[PDB]
Design a protein around this ligand. Sequence first.
Ligand SMILES: CCCCCCCCCCC#CCOCc1ccc(CCC(=O)O)cc1
Ligand SMILES: [Fe+2]
Ligand SMILES: [K+]
Length: 552
Amino acid sequence: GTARTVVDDPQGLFKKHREEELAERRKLYRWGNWKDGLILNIASTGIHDLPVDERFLEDKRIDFEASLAKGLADLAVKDSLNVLMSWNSLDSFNRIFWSGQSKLAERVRDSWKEDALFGYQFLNGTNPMLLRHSVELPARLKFPPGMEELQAQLEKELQGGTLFEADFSLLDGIKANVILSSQQYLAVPLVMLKLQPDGKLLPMVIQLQLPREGSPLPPLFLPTDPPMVWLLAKCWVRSSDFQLHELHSHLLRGHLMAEVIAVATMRCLPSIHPIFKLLIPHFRYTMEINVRARNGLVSDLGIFDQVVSTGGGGHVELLRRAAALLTYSSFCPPDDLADRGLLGVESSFYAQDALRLWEVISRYVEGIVSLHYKTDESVKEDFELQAWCREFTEIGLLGAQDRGFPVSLQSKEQLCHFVTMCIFTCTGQHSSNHLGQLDWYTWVPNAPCTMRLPPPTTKDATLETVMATLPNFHQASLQMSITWQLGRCQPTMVALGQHEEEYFSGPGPKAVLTKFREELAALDKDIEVRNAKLALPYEYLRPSRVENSVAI
Ligand SMILES: CCCCCCCCCCC#CCOCc1ccc(CCC(=O)O)cc1
Ligand SMILES: [Fe+2]
Ligand SMILES: [K+]
């Protein structure tokens, strides 16, 4: 039917039906709280408890299960051969790098030791969310004696506007896992990088640990250190990026935020509501995938506990600390990118595509909003909308109005912005953090799920040190299995905009959708043409690859 807000219905012709639907919604979709301090989730002990309309269809259920089975059968074969052999060379990781890898993963296996490939991933790799433009040297970067030349190169880049940083201080104080009684280890690194005129982003220095007042300074690793020393330092930043990417950029910001959006929407916006109709398709499978994740991925004795250095509880502590710090602006590429100083960096394909995708969605949302809300007053008086943002910000996000989340929507502009934030969260925000796994994480030394020795406090690493720190064959194989499972071409995916159900009636909304689809296709083509000229195509925000919801 035609959508109708409560403002559209002063005689209450649809009041009883919408009120009855919301009362049933609020019984079926209740808030749960998997861990103290985390943003809230759907209340459901496991997948069998979920409302029926949230369950995987058969095709998705078969796909998700069978793909685990295949990943686990491959892990069994890998492990059965590797126990019979030595594991004493970086070439040992070849033995687990089976056929069927993506073209980009084959490039990573070839080039992972290149400093330019290490730096490239901060712009356009699996985790584009951490890098920030530097306007001063961080207070933690303290120089041991003899490093005057480093200090001058850092000053030249800073004066030229070309100094960037990746600071992993969220890992400070996080407890590391113990796996089959062997201690795992975490670092708390900082990497300073230079942006070159040709677009390359090069690491200048790495510090692995925070200085401690009563202690000698951490060493500063440099690209001129002995090859294994600098390699080990880089591996440690890569292992640290795996932890903050998967937990903060991917789980919290993609998956868990999309679930908060979904639950608050189910609880407050009835099916006759235009903004329900606009949002719905973008929630597909989010609650079941997350329930599955809480019961097998990040659960006690789950994947993280089995193979990941933050596993065993530290991962939950990091989630609660990151949850307390989320800001609204960080979910909106125009604000996030300005704030991090990535706007205008021609080498950031993530920035260029994120901003364009945000605009195309913004136009679609504005289209639908203007069909149903003629004035700012018609937004202000929509009490379902007002209940909606409050439930989202106050209950779902544990009181986040001081971090920029809305508790009222008082204009069409505001409504459009917030809806746009919601749709981008469920789509591009996830795709850009999820799709890299297949290309960058299947070559395990490029993103070690764990580390088995403490980070070095000297410059004497050998290959033996590197092999003994890097994941063992089992940990590395399970990493490959799950990253393939999640990362691989999704046979049941719905691409952005391509949902088949018609929530809206009428030519009005149909025309806005047709235009969204046309603009998305034109953007996809423009990225495809840019990518044909690049050494490494940036694929993760192309509309043809961006999924319509968080489903995996
Ligand atoms: C060694 C770990 C490699 C993979 C790390 C991936 C972390 C992903 C973080 C964000 C997310 C999510 C949704 O989670 C998907 C999910 C759910 C259940 C399971 C366990 C059973 C199975 O693999 O089928 C794995 C993955
Ligand atoms: Fe995901
Ligand atoms: K209206």
